[PDB]
Amino acid sequence: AETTSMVSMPLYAVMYPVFNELERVNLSAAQTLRAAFIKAEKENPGLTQDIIMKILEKKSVEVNFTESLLRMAADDVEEYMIPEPEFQDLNEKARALKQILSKIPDEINDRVRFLQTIKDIASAIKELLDTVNNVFEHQKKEFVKYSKSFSDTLKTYFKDGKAINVFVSANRLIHQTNLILQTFK
Amino acid sequence: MVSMPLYAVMYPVFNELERVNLSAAQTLRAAFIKAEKENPGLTQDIIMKILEKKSVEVNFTESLLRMAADRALKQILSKIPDEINDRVRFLQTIKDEFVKYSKSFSDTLKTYFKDGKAINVFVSANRLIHQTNLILQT
């Protein structure tokens, strides 16, 4: 506590929380990475800080990457395709939602087009919701959670102007849709 | 591929710290390589989680900048996170390898008025401080 430098704080304030969240997904990876960061930090105080700053400086790469995933999500046209009417409706709704979500980076640079896109996305989410209700619950609550999270992300975007948040939330909503399609399969 | 941000982000980040430390960078590289190899897309999640803790990081960087006051150069540089809010005061405070880092800091300041991202100013200030330390110790 009193022996560890102040510069080593980002380890425990940023890296430790991440490693703890990872400890549920994979204990070995979390433990290994944590050990590496501890070694590196003790041998070189203020290293984790420099790493995080270096990451913040290469943020454009991450924006380009997330946007790339969002655009390439269009190639997931008929992936995870499920033999019954409601199943058809389901497939079409999921497809339409993912397809309209993949076109976000095109419309986000124009307020009008982006707003209309928000309209269409809202309609798609509502229709997919109703269709899910037809097919009928954890995946549902997940989808809703990430949906309202996407809305709140939009709310945050209209203040900030950072498109990367929207891209990430959209990608997560798409991933959720895919997960639900897997659950149905 | 989802394992791209490993090489695209972490690889150059580790590579651009090999002058201060060597083996630590290699151990970090190895750890990330294995963890991503067994669990694809993990590095992306980590990077995103780090980007999510942006506020805490900016706060700490500000604190780290104010901490450098404890000579005139350091004290003037330590007031930045509290003077940059007011444009006039910030202007006056602006008026108030190492040399390369100084002019790179100048470039950072010049880019700030285009961006508005004071975080880069904080970082470059801290690196200027680290360079002053690097010079004074040698």
Swiss-Prot record, chain A:
Q: Which consequence is recorded for altering residue 119 to D? A: Loss of interaction with CCM2 and PXN
**How does the record classify its membrane topology?**
Peripheral membrane protein
In the record, what lineage is assigned to the organism producing the protein?
Eukaryota, Metazoa, Chordata, Craniata, Vertebrata
Location within or outside the cell: Cytoplasm; Golgi apparatus membrane; Cell membrane
The location annotated for the cross-link Glycyl lysine isopeptide (Lys-Gly) (interchain with G-Cter in SUMO2) is 162
UniProt-recorded name of the protein:
Programmed cell death protein 10
- The organism encoding this protein is Homo sapiens (Human)
- Residues in a coiled coil are none
Q: Which GO terms describe its biological process?
A: angiogenesis; cellular response to leukemia inhibitory factor; endothelium development; establishment of Golgi localization; Golgi reassembly; intracellular signal transduction; intrinsic apoptotic signaling pathway in response to hydrogen peroxide; negative regulation of apoptotic process
* N6-acetyllysine: residues bearing it: 155
Q: Name one GO molecular function term.
A: protein homodimerization activity
This chain's function reads: Promotes cell proliferation. Modulates apoptotic pathways. Increases mitogen-activated protein kinase activity and STK26 activity. Important for cell migration, and for normal structure and assembly of the Golgi complex. Part of the striatin-interacting phosphatase and kinase (STRIPAK) complexes. STRIPAK complexes have critical roles in protein (de)phosphorylation and are regulators of multiple signaling pathways including Hippo, MAPK, nuclear receptor and cytoskeleton remodeling.
Q: Which GO terms describe its cellular component?
A: cytoplasm; cytosol; extracellular exosome; FAR/SIN/STRIPAK complex; Golgi apparatus; Golgi membrane; plasma membrane
Q: Which disease is it linked to?
A: Cerebral cavernous malformations 3: A form of cerebral cavernous malformations, a congenital vascular anomaly of the central nervous system that can result in hemorrhagic stroke, seizures, recurrent headaches, and focal neurologic deficits. The lesions are characterized by grossly enlarged blood vessels consisting of a single layer of endothelium and without any intervening neural tissue, ranging in diameter from a few millimeters to several centimeters. CCM3 inheritance is autosomal dominant.
The organs and tissues expressing this protein are described as: Ubiquitous.
Q: How does it assemble?
A: Homodimer. Interacts (via C-terminus) with CCM2. Interacts (via C-terminus) with PXN. Interacts (via N-terminus) with STK25. Interacts (via N-terminus) with STK26. Interacts (via N-terminus) with STK24. Interacts with GOLGA2. Identified in a complex with KRIT1 and CCM2. Interacts with KDR/VEGFR2. Interaction with KDR/VEGFR2 is enhanced by stimulation with VEGFA. Interacts with RIPOR1 (via C-terminus); this interaction is required for the association of RIPOR1 with either STK24 and STK26 kinases and occurs in a Rho-independent manner.
Q: Which UniProt keywords apply?
A: Acetylation, Angiogenesis, Apoptosis, Cell membrane, Cytoplasm, Golgi apparatus, Isopeptide bond, Membrane, Ubl conjugation
Similarity field:
Belongs to the PDCD10 family.
